[PDB]
Structure formats: structure tokens, C-alpha cells
Amino acid sequence: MAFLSGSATYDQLADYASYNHAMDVNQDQQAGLDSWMSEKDKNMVKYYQRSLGKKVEGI
Amino acid sequence: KAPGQIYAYDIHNTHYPYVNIKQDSQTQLLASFRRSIASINPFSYRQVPSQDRAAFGLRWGNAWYAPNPYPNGIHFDRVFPTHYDPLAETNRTKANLQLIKYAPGNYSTLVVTSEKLPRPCIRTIQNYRRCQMVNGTEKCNSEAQDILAICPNWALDHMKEKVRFYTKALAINNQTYIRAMQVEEYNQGRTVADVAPKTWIHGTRQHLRPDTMWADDRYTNITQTEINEAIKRVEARKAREHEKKPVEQANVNANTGEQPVRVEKSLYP
Amino acid sequence: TIFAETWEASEYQYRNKANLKTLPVNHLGKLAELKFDFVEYKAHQLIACHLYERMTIHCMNQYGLFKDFYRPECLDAQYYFKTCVELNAAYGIQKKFFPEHFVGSPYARPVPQFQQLGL
Amino acid sequence: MDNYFTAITLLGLRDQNLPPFKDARLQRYKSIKKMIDLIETTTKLAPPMPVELFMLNPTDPEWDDDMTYPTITH
Amino acid sequence: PVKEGQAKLWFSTKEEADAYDDKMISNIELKSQDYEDENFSPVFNRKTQEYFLEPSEKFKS
Numbered sequence A: 001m002a003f004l005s006g007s008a009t010y011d012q013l014a015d016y017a018s019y020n021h022a023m024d025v026n027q028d029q030q031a032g033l034d035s036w037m038s039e040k041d042k043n044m045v046k047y048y049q050r051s052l053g054k055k056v057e058g059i
Numbered sequence B: 001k002a003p004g005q006i007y008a009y010d011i012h013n014t015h016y017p018y019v020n021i022k023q024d025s026q027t028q029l030l031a032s033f034r035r036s037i038a039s040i041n042p043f044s045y046r047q048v049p050s051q052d053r054a055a056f057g058l059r060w061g062n063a064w065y066a067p068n069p070y071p072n073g074i075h076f077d078r079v080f081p082t083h084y085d086p087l088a089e090t091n092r093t094k095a096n097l098q099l100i101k102y103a104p105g106n107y108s109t110l111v112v113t114s115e116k117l118p119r120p121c122i123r124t125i126q127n128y129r130r131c132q133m134v135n136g137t138e139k140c141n142s143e144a145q146d147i148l149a150i151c152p153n154w155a156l157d158h159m160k161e162k163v164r165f166y167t168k169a170l171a172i173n174n175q176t177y178i179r180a181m182q183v184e185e186y187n188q189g190r191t192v193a194d195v196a197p198k199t200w201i202h203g204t205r206q207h208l209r210p211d212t213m214w215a216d217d218r219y220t221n222i223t224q225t226e227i228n229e230a231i232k233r234v235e236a237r238k239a240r241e242h243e244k245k246p247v248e249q250a251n252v253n254a255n256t257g258e259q260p261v262r263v264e265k266s267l268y269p
Numbered sequence C: 001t002i003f004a005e006t007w008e009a010s011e012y013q014y015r016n017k018a019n020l021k022t023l024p025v026n027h028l029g030k031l032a033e034l035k036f037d038f039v040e041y042k043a044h045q046l047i048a049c050h051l052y053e054r055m056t057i058h059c060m061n062q063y064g065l066f067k068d069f070y071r072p073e074c075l076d077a078q079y080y081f082k083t084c085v086e087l088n089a090a091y092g093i094q095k096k097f098f099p100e101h102f103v104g105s106p107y108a109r110p111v112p113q114f115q116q117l118g119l
Numbered sequence D: 001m002d003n004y005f006t007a008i009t010l011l012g013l014r015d016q017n018l019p020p021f022k023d024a025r026l027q028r029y030k031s032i033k034k035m036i037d038l039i040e041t042t043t044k045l046a047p048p049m050p051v052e053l054f055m056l057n058p059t060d061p062e063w064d065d066d067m068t069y070p071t072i073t074h
Numbered sequence E: 001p002v003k004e005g006q007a008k009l010w011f012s013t014k015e016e017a018d019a020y021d022d023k024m025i026s027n028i029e030l031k032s033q034d035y036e037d038e039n040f041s042p043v044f045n046r047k048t049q050e051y052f053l054e055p056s057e058k059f060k061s
């Protein structure tokens, strides 16, 4: 209900699912390849949103 | 006086390995039947060459086999721009006369070659070197002039340019030397006495753990509880490092009508 | 040596010579032609010529080197791997000792100093 | 991309896998840059050996005959 | 807890080593297949063993 009643909840999950690189990383994680992430890696979806033209702050 | 056999004959022990790359049932069944009767078959062809008999290449059904040419984006249009992409298809489509012409050398690599100087020009160079090592440089003026006279001018241009190339290559090799022999900040004052008694295998996966969480069973017994406590500790260490952050620099490529600097691209768009 | 996963295609094109070859990225479509099951990580597919090397190992593990490896998907992987490391070795040497042959180099067409303009 | 096998070996691709994220993965590429300059320098220090060991001098006057290959037109 | 093995880390002090484990552990996301778990994932369950490409016995033979 919290996901459905939210406004940006649909956008955060859609932009992550539409980012091909984030899905390639997720495909490797399911196969057994995982590691720690830097601050720049944790924003890989925020960079993808900015490139499309969204106004995302806190990069 | 038996004919010589190549090394490949001792791998297969026969001159008639019916190798067909086409992986269909009809082809491989006929190849197995033809492979067994090849000793008494009049319609038999060799695929292993010998000193006395040439051979055929790999078969593809009734035609012949050759690998797909390495992807090459170079092409030439005839009627309309096709926007040929060598990575968009598995097998390269055939070139139609009105559509495209591909780059030359379907099966070709990049090498460096050299022309061979004329034989008389070589004989004058050998005579100068021999007279030089025997009599010295100062008594070879006659042999030095024979080179400039007998060697054609295109050879003298090649000889002049070889010296400039090897002079360029000499400086490029020495600049790599200076970068290689440079003492870094993490190796200041360290000598061969400070090297650890280890070999290449001591840096592999069995001895040095990779930088991934599932490389081995190190973190297989970690529960959610220990994860939450670890998050509290990594955030506690960030209470001292977040105080520093680089300042935003100027965009050197702000002007669009200016040749932009090939700056390092961002990790993510 | 290329120290990254990606390279500018124009930096390996000649400026004063006809461009008859390119240095393309790995052909990921050939990876889908392998019929058997195998594990491949996306973190290894962009570095030059290595995908074709891993495809060759997967094919030489499933099949051998005799009468089973001789299929179109496996022979193209070995041919691409051999051709890729040959072209990259030649382009690497040409980039090291003939950097002025390529587009983007400041010596392909040198800009003169202001002292040569006579102003 | 020269010194392919050397760079692949230094990155550890012969025994392990690269980090799945571009940040650390791209730093690992730039880490071998010093070692490639060292290994390339070592390979250019080989001493010379007589060239007339496995190869006859092609500029010798003995080979001025320019002999052709006699064949049988079967 | 952290399990020790033949493959060792590359840190001089123990504080650097423990800091590396804390950084790696804080990034672990458990994906269990059993219901009634705080970390439950029927699909998109991650493996906990990394695959390594090696020449098999048929390869070297």
C-alpha cells in the first residue's frame, strides 16, 4: 500500500528496471558476483535519471 | 622413397577425415558413412595434405567452409546509406551490387613490411661497412660516394627515413624507461631487501582472497543481526571522513563552439 | 595497451591514410549462439578480445578439440580470439611508435607555434 | 591493446573475476599501467646473438644465381 | 561471524582488516527461499558462491 500510494515509488523502480547496466550488475549478483559499492556506485541510478533530464539532487 | 607426411597426419592417422562443419543430421550421418568407406571409396577426397597429394579444406555441406570474417565497420554504399553494423548480425550478409561493398581483405590482419633495397645498392653498403671496420671512417669517401650514386634516390629516401624512425622509437623506448624506473611515493627508500619471499602463485585466489564477497566461504555464516551492527560501525567511521570533499571545478567544455577536451567520461550517465 | 573497457573508435582510425579496418568492440551476439549452458558475467564482456577467449574455453570444455569442437559457433569464437589479439597487438604497437597516424593526435596535423606566423 | 595476455594476467582474470562495479573495476585497469611499462622495458634488453645461426645471409653473392624452381607440368 | 580460510587478506593491521570486513558485510543482502523470513525472495535469489572459469579435465587432456 505504501508503494502504491506513493508518487515517486513508481519512478524509482521504473528507472532502475530500465537502466540496462544496473540490470546487468543485478544479473551478475544473482550468478554469485557481488562486492561492496562506493558512493559513486550507489548513485548509478541518479546519474541515469539526470541524463534523461530529471531533476535529482544529492549526487 | 615414401612421401613425407605432415604432423597432422599423426593426429588423425588418416588422410580422409570427413570433417563437415554443417551440424545437420543428414550431413553428419553421410560424413560418418563416407568416413568408414574412404579406404575403398572411389569418390573420396583428402582433407589432410601430404608431400605427394594436396588436400581440400573444411567442408560445409556440399560447399566449402570459411569462418565469418572479423567484424569490420568499413563499407561502401551504392544506392542508399545502409548504416551497416557488423555487430548486428551473426553471419555477414552477402554483398549485393546495388546495396553495399565491404572492405577488402575478408581474412586479413595488420602487419608491418619493408621493401628490399636493390642488390647493387646493398653491395655498396656492404663494401662501405667492410672498408669502415678495416680502414676506418675517414678513408671511405670513395665508398660513401658510390652509395649516393648507385643507390637510386628512392632508396636514399628510405635510408634517410629509417634513421629518423629509429630515432623516434629510441626516444619512445627511453621515455617508457624513465616512467618505469621512476621511484613512486609508496616505494621511497625500499630496496630488494624489503621484498617479501613470494612468487606469482602467492597472489592468486588460493592465497590472496579476491575483492568479492562470495569468492570463498568467508561471509557465509553472517546473519542479518551482524549486518545491522556493521552498518552502525561504517557510519561511525564516516563521522570523520565526510568533513572533506573536493570543490566544484570549472567546466572547460562550457563553450559548444569550441573544440572540447577529451576528458575522462563519467562512470554513469 | 588499452587500460579501459571502452575506447574511442575514432582514435584508432587513420587521418592521412584510407580507413579500411576498424577496431570494433566485442561481438556480444556471438555469445548467444552457444547452445550449451554456461555462466558469464557482464563485467568481463567489454574488455578487448577477452570475451572471445572465454567463449573458446567454454567451447573447449563442453566439447574437446576433435570432431565435436568443429562447429560454426566454436570455430568463429577461436578465429575471432586469434584475430582480435593480432589486430590489437598491431594497433597497440602502431599507437606506441606511430601515434601521429591516428585521428585525435596533436602530431597528425601539427598546429604551429605563434613565433612561426611572423606577426 | 597490446600486451593483452600480460594485462589479463596482471588483472587476475586467470584465477578470479573482476569487481562487478565500474568504479573499482576501472581503477584496477589503471593499476597495471606501471607494470606494463616495466615489463615492456625488460623485453628490450636482450643481448644480440649471431644472425648467421639459423639463417643464411641473403645478400651473399652465392645467391645471385636467381635460380628458378624446375617443375613437371603433369 | 567471519570464517577464516586459506585465502588471506592483504592488510597490515587488524583495524584495517576489520574495517574491510565491516564494509563488505554492510553491503550483504540476504536472499532466502523460505517463507516467514525477513529476507525472503522467491525469484531473484542470489547465489553465495562465485563461479570461476577454469580449463576442465577434457580441456587439458
Ligand SMILES: CCCCCCCCCCCCCCCCCC(=O)OC[C@H](COP(=O)([O-])OCC(O)COP(=O)([O-])OC[C@@H](COC(=O)CCCCCCCCCCCCCCCCC)OC(=O)CCCCCCCCCCCCCCCCC)OC(=O)CCCCCCCCCCCCCCCCC
Pocket (backbone or CB within 6 Å): A010, A013, A014, A017, A026, E031, E040, E041, E042, E043, E044
Ligand atoms: C494485456 C492485458 C491482459 C494480460 C495481462 C498480463 C499481465 C502480465 C504482464 C506483466 C505486468 C507487468 C508487471 C510485472 C511485475 C514484475 C513481476 C516479476 O517479475 O516478479 C518479480 C517479483 C519480485 O521478486 P522478489 O522475490 O520480491 O525480489 C526480491 C529481491 O530482493 C529484490 O531486490 P533486488 O536487489 O534483487 O532487485 C531485483 C530487481 C529486478 O528487476 C527486474 O527484474 C525488473 C522487474 C520489472 C518490474 C519493474 C517495474 C515495476 C513497476 C511497478 C508498477 C507495476 C504495477 C503492476 C502493473 C499491472 C498493470 C495492470 O528489482 C526487482 O525485484 C523489481 C521489483 C519487482 C516488484 C514488482 C511490483 C509488484 C507488483 C504489484 C502488483 C502485484 C499484482 C500481483 C497479482 C498476482 C495475482 C496472481 O516476484 C513476485 O512478485 C512474486 C509474486 C508474488 C508472490 C506471491 C505469490 C503469488 C503467486 C501468483 C502465481 C500466479 C502468477 C500469475 C498467473 C496469471 C494467470 C493466472
